[PDB]
């Protein structure tokens, strides 16, 4: 296959300065006329001029008004247009093409496509070449003048990037609009939308320059009532970037548009951000609570790209983490500020240590700046995004707010209106570091290893206390397992945020400090430590690593109770659970393998259970935090700690643990479920789509967590509570009633009730589908068939397909049925979906990423299905690359 290598980057021989487009939409074709004002660069060596262009039907090609002919002056193979060098001018020239495309049959949702009754584009990464010919790479920056025309009754709103400079009527019931985007950009940031869209609008005045910006949010008419929270989130996003980073919006107008059919969450096209409707639309009567946080994060994320991605863009796609890691970091700072709840940072940690750690121990393991690819689309990964964000966050930890802000401003200003690389970012941060250290010989060269080295570091600790001297030492070691990317791993620059807790009184013993580990091992010593402490390590999860605290469970309980840092408290609890999970897993596994008639299980620590009860009963402790402590670690976290995992043994392990704890705590759980009701379900703000009480939402989360535990337990008469909960006006509550009813004969009544409540809102019905799919039902395979036949049917909507199948794949007992029937079901969906949407098919491969971690019978079953998928004729390049890498063939 054609493999692109990071080291081989070279600037083009050509420059494209201006793009002038006419996009004429008709019922059964769209005609795209494009003039590129081009020139020869200083790198040119008289090569052929080669344009990307995929699936285009050529009407005409010319250079400087000279028609070019196929076979004579050019060739086209449905991927690349080659203009032979003799006909490539030697100075400024105009290249003209006209092509025909068909958005109405574009079910891949890349390029120009139809989503219900809206025409929309998605060009990142390689979609612009599906619209017209270009040198489709992000260093080819140009200014754009775009005219869209269409039938006026069908498509009354026409949008492209930038200022709308004219609107005109056209004979035969058509109309046009012309846009000028003054900001130089790569083609991946081009967008156009045409539809019968409705809007909400507001005016925002920038903080420093007092520029008036018109803000528009758009959707189809049915859902215009669901736009207000997005608009509010945009206003919050703009103010945060002003307040924290000093960054103001740079056009007179910003449009956000919701579309029903979208492969991912949203896209930062300049002035014209386009969203999956699931990440832009909500209403409190018709959305679950999680929609609100999702919309806040996604609006924020696309907005933050206006600097980190748009005004400073990528030299090449290997630099992706420079825009995505950095934007995720900006997004997370923003969400943490807006929600003011500790669960926000914890949720991010949970995501990394489950999905990203699994990826990094898989055969798909890559550094955050990859060295090669076949389809760039397969590198939009939780590694590039979420490990990238942690790498961008560690700069903040190392520098502190003031010197971080200085480095970021160095970067954003130096590279404004241009491309950048990961090195450029590291250089700007290094200038801030020298200033912070007041040492112009300090450097961050070692830091670069976070961009180039794959795998997750393991950090381990030993402690010693000298009572006579009042002197404490922390000895720290780091290790990264060799892999396919590096046979020898080097030590990283690891910042370790640390406190020391007095176990007597629970108080802080030092100013929090950040240890800078730069070697394979080091010993950090503290004087004036009056008693032997318990260390509070990696506060805030200060680096993306595996932490081996080497603490006793008694010490972990003391931190859970008394430490200040939410992450350390949560991790201490996580660690106690993991010790128990691995011990019980081993006990169950030995019993199963040895076919014992009897055996013992280690009970859950009774003092840990008491600590859980103490935290839950504390009315001043945080509800969201409580919901993390009564939940075992996610299966995808656990699996990073087990080789040859027997999924059914794990399921029995988790059931035993939950049951041990509930046998002690279920009365506490019920009491709290009832006592939290009044505040959790208070209707303050129910009619206010501009304000969300995140603390209240975390109270609902805790209630819904407790109700699941009590339902699985068959707590006496809990069905009464389930039925009452189904009458709540909050969808998070009535959909929880369906999930928790799985354990009772009432499930199919609740299935019907909630279907009727959900069926008339597209996105609520998708949340109902997820609720059914994740239900802990012994008959889940028959339920899935019922969803396919009655609700999903022949939908090509990625949100429908994802809703039906992905939750079910997390069903540890049922998906991993030792017959392989789960693996076969999902593989058939992948293959089916790959015939029209390769990106979505690759998403649906997610469950297979852990294949080589399973017991050898399940390994064999997964491998069989992966190789069957690989045999499919006309398999996409996206899917074939993914599966070849995943199965150790590429
Ligand atoms: C909404 C942001 C995340 C968003 N990216 C995203 O939703 N999915 C990843 C992705 C995958 C592929 C293949 C392509 C081609 C693009 C994106 C984002 O980064 N938005 O700016 C939270
Ligand atoms: Mg075509
Ligand atoms: Mg996010
Ligand atoms: Mg639909
Ligand atoms: Zn992004």
């Amino acid at each position: 296959p054609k493999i692109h290598y990071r080291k081989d980057y070279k600037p083009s021989g050509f420059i494209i300065n201006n793009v002038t487009l006419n996009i004429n939409i008709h019922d059964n074709e769209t005609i795209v006329r494009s003039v590129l004002d081009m020139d020869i660069s200083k790198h040119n060596v008289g090569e052929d001029l080669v344009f990307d262009g995929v699936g285009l039907k050529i009407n005409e090609i010319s250079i400087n008004n000279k028609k070019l002919v196929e076979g004579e002056e050019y060739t086209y193979d449905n991927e690349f247009l080659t203009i032979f060098s003799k006909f490539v001018p030697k100075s400024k020239f105009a290249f003209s093409s006209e092509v025909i495309i068909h958005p109405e049959t574009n079910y891949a949702l890349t390029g120009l496509y139809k989503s219900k009754n809206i025409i929309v584009s998605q060009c990142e990464a390689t979609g612009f070449r599906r619209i017209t010919f270009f040198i489709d790479r992000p260093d080819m920056m140009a200014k754009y003048d775009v005219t869209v025309t269409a039938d006026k009754e069908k498509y009354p709103v026409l949008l492209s990037n930038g200022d709308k400079v004219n609107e005109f009527e056209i004979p035969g019931g058509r109309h046009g609009a012309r846009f000028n985007d003054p900001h130089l950009k790569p083609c991946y940031l081009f967008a156009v939308v045409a539809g019968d869209l409705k809007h909400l609008s507001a005016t925002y005045i920038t903080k420093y320059t007092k520029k008036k910006v018109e803000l528009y949010v758009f959707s189809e008419e049915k859902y215009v009532s669901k736009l207000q929270w997005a608009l509010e989130c945009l206003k919050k996003s703009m103010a945060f970037d002003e307040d924290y980073f000093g960054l103001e919006y740079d056009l007179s107008r910003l449009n956000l548009v919701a579309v029903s059919d979208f492969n991912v969450g949203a896209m930062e096209n300049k002035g014209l951000n386009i969203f999956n409707a699931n990440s832009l639309l909500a209403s409190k009567k018709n959305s679950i609570d999680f929609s609100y946080a999702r919309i806040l994060t996604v609006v924020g994320h696309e907005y933050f790209h206006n600097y980190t991605g748009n005004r400073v863009t990528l030299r090449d796609w290997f630099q992706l983490t420079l825009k995505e890691g950095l934007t995720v970091h900006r997004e997370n700072l923003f969400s943490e500020e807006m929600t003011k709840t500790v669960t926000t940072r914890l949720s991010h940690v949970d995501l990394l240590r489950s999905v990203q750690f699994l990826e990094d121990s898989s055969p798909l393991s890559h550094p955050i700046r990859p060295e090669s690819y076949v389809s760039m689309e397969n590198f939009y990964t939780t590694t590039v995004y979420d490990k990238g964000s942690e790498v961008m966050r560690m700069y903040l930890t190392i520098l502190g707010e003031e010197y971080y802000k200085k480095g970021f401003d160095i970067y954003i200003k130096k590279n404004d209106g241009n491309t950048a690389t990961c090195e450029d970012f590291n250089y700007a941060m290094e200038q801030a570091y020298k200033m912070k250290k007041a040492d112009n010989s300090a450097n961050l060269n070692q830091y670069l290893l976070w961009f180039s080295q794959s795998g997750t570091p393991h950090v381990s600790f030993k402690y010693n206390y000298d009572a006579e001297k009042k002197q404490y030492s922390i000895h720290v070691n780091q290790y990264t397992k060799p892999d396919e990317n590096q046979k020898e791993k080097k030590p990283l620059f690891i910042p370790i945020s640390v406190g020391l807790i007095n176990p007597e009184n629970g108080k802080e013993m030092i100013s929090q400090t950040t240890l800078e580990l730069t070697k394979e091992s080091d010993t950090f010593v503290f004087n004036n430590i009056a008693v032997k402490p318990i260390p509070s390590l990696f506060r805030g999860f200060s680096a993306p690593v595996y932490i081996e605290d080497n603490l006793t469970d008694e010490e972990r309980i003391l931190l859970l109770k008394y430490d200040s840092d939410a992450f350390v408290r949560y991790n201490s609890c996580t660690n106690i659970y993991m010790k128990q999970i691995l011990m019980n897993y081993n006990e169950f596994l030995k019993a199963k393998n040895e076919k014992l008639e009897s055996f013992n299980l280690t009970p859950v620590n009774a003092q840990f259970i008491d600590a859980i009860k103490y935290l839950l009963e504390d009315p001043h402790a945080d509800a969201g935090f409580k919901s993390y402590i009564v939940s075992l670690p996610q299966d995808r976290y656990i699996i990073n700690f087990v080789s040859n995992l027997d999924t059914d043994v794990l399921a029995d392990t988790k059931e035993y643990i939950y049951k041990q704890i509930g046998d002690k705590l279920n009365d506490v759980y019920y009491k709290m479920f009832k006592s939290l009701e009044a505040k959790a379900d208070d209707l303050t703000y129910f009619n206010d789509e501009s304000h969300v009480d995140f603390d209240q939402m975390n109270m609902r989360t805790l209630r819904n967590t407790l109700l699941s535990l009590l339902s699985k337990a068959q707590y006496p008469n809990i069905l009464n509570e389930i039925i009452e909960h189904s009458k709540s006006p909050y969808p998070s509550n009535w959909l929880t009633s369906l999930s928790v009813s799985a354990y009772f004969d009432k499930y199919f009544e609740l299935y019907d009730k909630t279907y009727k409540l959900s069926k008339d809102d597209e996105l609520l019905l998708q949340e109902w589908l997820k609720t059914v799919s994740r239900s802990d039902r012994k008959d889940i395979y028959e339920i899935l068939k019922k969803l396919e036949n009655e609700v999903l049917k022949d939908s090509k909507n990625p949100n429908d397909i994802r809703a039906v199948y992905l939750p079910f794949t997390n069903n540890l007992r049922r998906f991993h049925d030792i017959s392989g029937k789960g693996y076969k079901l999902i593989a058939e969906v992948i293959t089916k979906t790959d015939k029209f949407n390769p990106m979505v098919a690759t998403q649906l491969c997610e469950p297979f990423k852990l294949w080589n971690k399973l017991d050898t019978k399940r390994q064999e079953l997964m491998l069989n299905e992966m190789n069957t998928m690989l045999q499919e004729p006309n398999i996409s390049n996206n899917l074939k690359e993914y599966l070849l890498r995943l199965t150790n063939k590429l």
Side-chain angles (χ1 to χ4, degrees), residues 277-321:
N278 73 19
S279 297
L280 201 66
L281 307 184
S283 75
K284 289 177 189 188
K285 192 191 191 315
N286 289 300
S287 303
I288 63 163
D289 289 342
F290 278 129
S291 296
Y292 289 87
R294 174 73 175 165
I295 289 163
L296 180 66
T297 61
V298 177
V299 167
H301 182 106
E302 310 314 330
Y303 181 74
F304 299 136
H305 275 302
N306 196 47
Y307 283 89
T308 51
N310 301 2
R311 284 283 288 269
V312 181
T313 193
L314 312 179
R315 189 193 69 171
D316 60 69
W317 287 116
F318 297 98
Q319 316 303 316
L320 184 57
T321 195

Side-chain angles (χ1 to χ4, degrees), residues 294 297-298 301 328 331-332 348 351 386:
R294 174 73 175 165
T297 61
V298 177
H301 182 106
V328 175
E331 162 208 337
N332 293 174
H348 304 155
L351 282 156
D386 303 313

